[model samples]
Target: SCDLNATNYIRGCQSKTYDGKIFPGKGGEKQWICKDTIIHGDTNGACIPPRTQNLCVGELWDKSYGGRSNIKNDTKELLKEKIKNAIHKETELLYEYHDTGTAIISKNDKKGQKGKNDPNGLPKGFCHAVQRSFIDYKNMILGTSVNIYEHIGKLQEDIKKIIEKGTPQQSTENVNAWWKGIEREMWDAVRCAITKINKKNNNSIFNGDECGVSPPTDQSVSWFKEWGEQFCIERLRYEQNIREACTEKKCINSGDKIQGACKRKCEKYKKYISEKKQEWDKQKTKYENKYVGKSASDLLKENYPECISANFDFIFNDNIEYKTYYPYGDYSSICSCE
Candidate 1:
């Protein structure tokens, strides 16, 4: 019979159990379960190594590499910097639209006469393009703060527990795995946040459907009304389609039914917008270069105080790289004991 109660002792690799009491459920026959089964509660319990013994044996390796504190601090700082930089980059782009004489204007009740903050006076599609761009911009900025930032804060706390307290048996290998896993998690959050902003910029803002119709270059406002009217008609149709499709599909939740129809409708306009946007960009580049040094968009800052400051609450749900082991600490010096 094996000494099942011997907590400090472990079976050697070469030994075999004649009596299988080490694993209580199994018959008294030799098995593959080594020291782990005896120490843990159950025969089927996880095979965590005994923590008491220092497993440093042959060839001293760097035990101090990838320190938890260093990882935590460095990662924390990098995340903060990247978040700020993203916000700043977004801010600059928004200001470009505002400064380029193509400022987003709200259609006033009184028509023809350029009213307060009216972008309609510029060209037909210019105002609407900026409007669509602003909508996504606001979403991206807030989403970062609400979803990404909030989750990151919680994840950092989770990582702290994993690194410092570690597992019950505190196997160095397990700890290392946990550390690496958490590092990936941290980066995943960052990647999600950055990707969202970039997606908006690429898909809708710069090379996208928002800025589809370009204004005429000649110093004439004759085609303004015609272009504007055309856009308004298309806009109204799209909006009505969304309402009808969503209502029909009962898209109360995030389902593909409504999205499929809407995506098709949006696709119809892609060619219209894509070519126009390319042409518009060439014209806009002159202004972009001209006012590159102008201060950040005060309008955006003042309007979206919460987004700029990142002071609010929001719920975000997404997949995490869920695994039993998380990477942390250095496992280089540990011995190869079963």
Candidate 2:
């Protein structure tokens, strides 16, 4: 909806930290939100587009008007600089994905769901009947990579200001944030939840009581498979408890035990059950405190890196206008379009 036509292009341009005013900054003259960080004034200005006030980064990102639009083109130039600027295959990553597959052109050459030779169906990869650039993969790759590039760039500028002017107490906590990033905290929390849950579960025998605290075996909850899986499983186990008596009201074989035996059994069972239940109360608190009473978002960011690189693709990819939200706020606060 927010196409990058000249009108919308001018409409969507924004400057950092200002409310409702987004200007393209006349020749890309950007300002440091902090001309002074420790003493940085909260004063701001910029002309923001009304449509973009609610429009997400992804929606705004898709507004790219194809060729030569500065937003798309320049953002692209920056990352390309990273690629071509490197003469190092001695680099940490390999850039050979450009040669992995074929680009298909004609329906006659097509098969399966790609049943026709349509413009949209053109295959962009290592292979092609004609040497067409793998534009689709490139789109995905750019969207994802830029998402991260922007994120790191954001950190770079923000950190630079802190270095230039700084907070009253040089909070190492703030310094640590610059170093570890938000998702790392979430990862550690999820890890802790997993360890605690698994350790409590290692002695799988439930303290059979009336809370159903004794849950079924869950070796199948694979933390190894995906980012959110481990956290989900830990939560289920944390809330489960044995909710019923381990023994029957009446022993089936012997019609009924004499009052003497029955009395002793009930008392013993009551103590055992009460102790188990009490522990549940205590453990419930322990679970809450230890697991950090966190929102689900905290457990999910290590799911991808740089927004893109290897298989890393998507909004975390850098200024991607992902139209997606990494919720419950932390570094997420910084993600409004610049």
Candidate 3:
């Protein structure tokens, strides 16, 4: 739907401005109109009376006297340069952290350190190879031929200012801040790209479908998903409680015929279930309001219509397997549709 070479079409959409300042459009004021001619077909010597009207006119009204261009190419170029610089700065910061983090883990491993092994290590023989057979696993898992130590050394030097001058808390905070800045830059670049694409193609050139809008930020979606996951956990715990109560009632009604071992086993199981329920509850609440009330179906329909078609079967097929795979097998997979 996007025309790569349609600069005229792009300029029309990018530079055209609605007369909203004169009289707001859409809410009972003047309706918004395209300020540029939307050339639909070649007008090869067609004759019409001057100022005659056509219902499906392919040209815009002459509003040069009232309208000024909305986009200035020079200004946009300057803004793009600034954005590129910011992006480079943030990306360099992230790379520094990633490099240093890897180096710290590697150094601890080589030194046979106990606690410094990330407290979370990869599967056996995955991080290092002590034998030739193990080397195969290492090579397969590591997936890179480059010497990470060199990269890590570079990272340590790059982030030395932040690490040396800042407190532990400050260092962690700065890393997160740097990541946030990177995310903002990425978002800005994406938004600009989309705007440019939309301009190059008329509203129809790209789907002007309402379904193509982006989701309402992270907070909106996270809250709903968190709430749903929490509710499931609470309900599971409630069911477990009911089961334990039934087991106890059965034992009492059995007139002590059940042996001590049986009773002990039931008690152990109950304890295990209680611990699991507690863990589930705690995890549920951690992100309780992170994405309240946002459904994947609703989000996909709104933010990614082209990728997710409107057909019921298409949507259902895309996500049905996910229901079982997420919040259990791989929690990160739950919201990562794209």
Candidate 4:
């Protein structure tokens, strides 16, 4: 027989019922109710334990020196913070210049009128101009450095042995290629710096019509008229002749004569080409002498050392090409960021 205890089998009341037949229970019948006495193991156990003194106590122990430590993690974090600070500082300085609208000298100064104050005390407001120039210049240099790092780094990684055996020319070629690839990035960084400065100073970084053509005024009207007449009469005539020659049909009967005429035309064309080339070379030389000389490179180097080192070819060679064909003078040479 099963050993079942009465206390363990106890059940609780289900519901109350009305009973008219019971005199003592006129409204409702009494419901049976019972409580279980069965005890489960630790039925009211604690949910969580309280912290004791032992748990709160600290311990000191020597760490194993077998593996590399995470010390560099802190160093890297610090470096990142430092770079962020530098960026912020540079950006703020640029903003200050922009907000003051002192980044550039006005074009009206040459007319003998009082112009805006040169807050930076730069001659002819040239400080701002130089700042803008450096922005572009620095960007160019940074881009070159980044490209060189990438290309050189990859080559070293992928073909370290081959690169080691490469000749000086080959090595130089690789370096130059790498430098050129990131030149734009460096230039872009410089631009970004300039832009930030401009934005902060509340000054327009560039003048639209400032670089526009100078219309002929009363004094120059006569000169302009003469120039136009010469172009129309002299230049236009030559142009028309060349055009006619090109368009005209060849005569089969006068083959040798036609060939002679063609040779003459070719000689004329060659002469024109040679003259144009000479003029271009002269202009280029003049530009190099004026702007790309020792002074220019020195000025650039004072701000960006990397640029000078990378562009040593242009810096060292006095025959560097200049391409400022447009009449716009160097605006960047006359202003500051603020």
Candidate 5:
């Protein structure tokens, strides 16, 4: 319940998660902040009383990416590697960011900094500060062509459209091409970073300081391929969760009865709602047991490594809304899988 003013604006507050509300900026783009919610701290230390670092802020803010990665390093190779690593981490965060609709920059945060004269607009305790720093760093390395930070938003939208249009019956060639496109963007950014940095330096290892039109190495391809496969597996699992649980009618009306033993069938055309509510509860538990609370990144490597090569043709049958039809009736019950 604090008032927004010239000196006490909400541009630099940190939210524990991406679920905070967005407020319009006076002189810049929209900013996300936890004004009356889960704020950790602010750049100006303007959070109301009981100022304490929230759990996520304490955990991730002072770690390696927060304080160690050097955006201004003069060494070409190290700077290039740092940029690559930053892009990779930011890519991983993209899913969570978009899914949660969290804010990535403060309102007055222009070009990754606070403002025109305020160079310290990068809030210290937020992961987004580091993510935003990469934007300025990218511009610094190359004029604008290799702005990897800038391309992620477009890539995210493309991925959504791909998923909306995809099906198990579709061939793997399209999926393969999707990942290949990501590879092209990622490596081009990396190569451009290295080339531009080398040109900025006086003593050049490669003559003419030009990285003479090189191609992506096998290593980079393998890395982005892993990310691509992970994306596929997660999407398939999500669609599968709906199809296998919602469409199957083994336990819709039965309360605690085993799925196959539900001989007391839900009467056809009855249109009666179940009294137990066990169907969705059961499905909810099943989904959590299968997909929630554990580490999602390692699920592919440890459990479904074949998802990389499988083309995801089995689970992804068709596009499905979160609502499902109740058995023997027209009632469209909400699917709890999500």
Candidate 6:
């Protein structure tokens, strides 16, 4: 809210959860957990931060990624172990830079006495900066050669269509919409890959699921035989697409400063709408339970239960517009039952 050109923007958590570490092949090929939202803080403060010490603006900015880990005198053998660890769970590892580094350069002062490493260098004692290394992890299920979204969106549309096309014999309440959501996200990732490899796309993403190759339709087929063919053909198709995508007419994004997002599905708005419905449902359910087993006659004894106009508005939903802004006027606010 501070005066940043007199523009005050309110900040709040858009969603309670966010992308979290995924564990793959546990029943489902992957799992996504929503993590707590984080807020940005100015230097030296945050809800969560590592405990490290030192007094340099650069150290504060670079944080641990540029400072420590150089006690590291080991060579290729540790590098082998790093590969081994990452191959399994993609564990975090620390490595040091061999060239001039932040800890090395910032330890001394810019315009100080005795190269800043002298008895009077750091004002009292040497710099408290404990240099650190950048961190990263690896996982395959985290990535797949197809837009998981395509898969998800396809399935979402699939079930939704099936539901819409079918009769009341199947109620959406019994549809396992929760599990459907997870499936939709994953398949959406798959579908995302399929769409990006278009003759209209770039090659940078061709290696990943974004390959120029399109996923094979799952027609009736034999076991490992069909799988291998699909895999190889897709690989070949992807290569073919690379040449096609780059062929000169090249109108890359209409051509400019950005690229297509690498997500399989963009479920943000879907989730937002879903959550809004959930809130509305919550309030509606409370009103519903107020008279659970009671019959209509019971309401008559209770004096013709006053209907909430909002409740009327929500029911049946088949509507006709009759415009009016009055809360009690009931003009356009009315949902035409007939």
Count of clashing residue pairs in every prediction:
13, 39, 10, 30, 1, 27
Give a tens-digit lDDT track for model 1, residues 17-54.
22221223344432111222221211111211111011
* Model 4 stretches astray by more than 4 angstroms: 1-175, 194-338
- Measured against the true structure, the TM-scores of the candidates, in listed sequence, are 0.19, 0.15, 0.19, 0.21, 0.20, 0.14
Q: Which is superior by lDDT, 1 or 6?
A: 1
lDDT per residue as tens, model 6, 104-126:
22212222222222232121111
State which candidate has the highest lDDT.
5
Score candidate 1 by lDDT.
0.28
Query: Candidate 4: global Cα-lDDT?
Result: 0.28
Query: Which pairs of residues collide in candidate 3?
Result: 221-291, 222-290, 222-291, 222-292, 223-290, 223-291, 223-292, 224-291, 224-292, 224-293
* Residue 195 C-alpha lDDT in model 1: 32
lDDT of 5 by residue, 162-279 (tens): 4335424353354444444444444454333333323333333422113224332211112223333333433333333334444545443434332322222223112122321232
Per-residue lDDT over 12-114 for candidate 2, one digit per residue giving the tens place of the 0 to 100 score: 2222211212222222222112111121011111111111122112211333464122223233224232222121110101111111111111111112222
Give lDDT tens digits, candidate 4, residues 114-141.
3343443222323333233233222222
lDDT of model 3 at position 160: 31
Stronger candidate by lDDT (2 vs 6): 2
Specify the poorest-scoring 10-residue window by lDDT in model 4: 49-58
Worst 10-residue lDDT window for candidate 2 reads 87-96
Please, what is the whole-model Cα lDDT of each candidate in the order they appear? Answer: 0.28, 0.24, 0.27, 0.28, 0.29, 0.23
The regions of model 3 sitting more than 4 angstroms off are 1-170, 176-292, 305-308, 312-338
Count: clashes, candidate 5 = 1
lDDT at 126, model 5 = 27
The CA root-mean-square deviation of candidate 1, after full C-alpha superposition on the true structure, stands at: 30.2
Better lDDT candidate (2, 3): 3
Per-residue error (Å), model 1, residue 84: 56
Q: Write the per-residue lDDT of candidate 3 for residues 13-93, one digit (tens) a residue.
A: 121111111112222212211112221112111111110111111111112565432222223233234333332222222
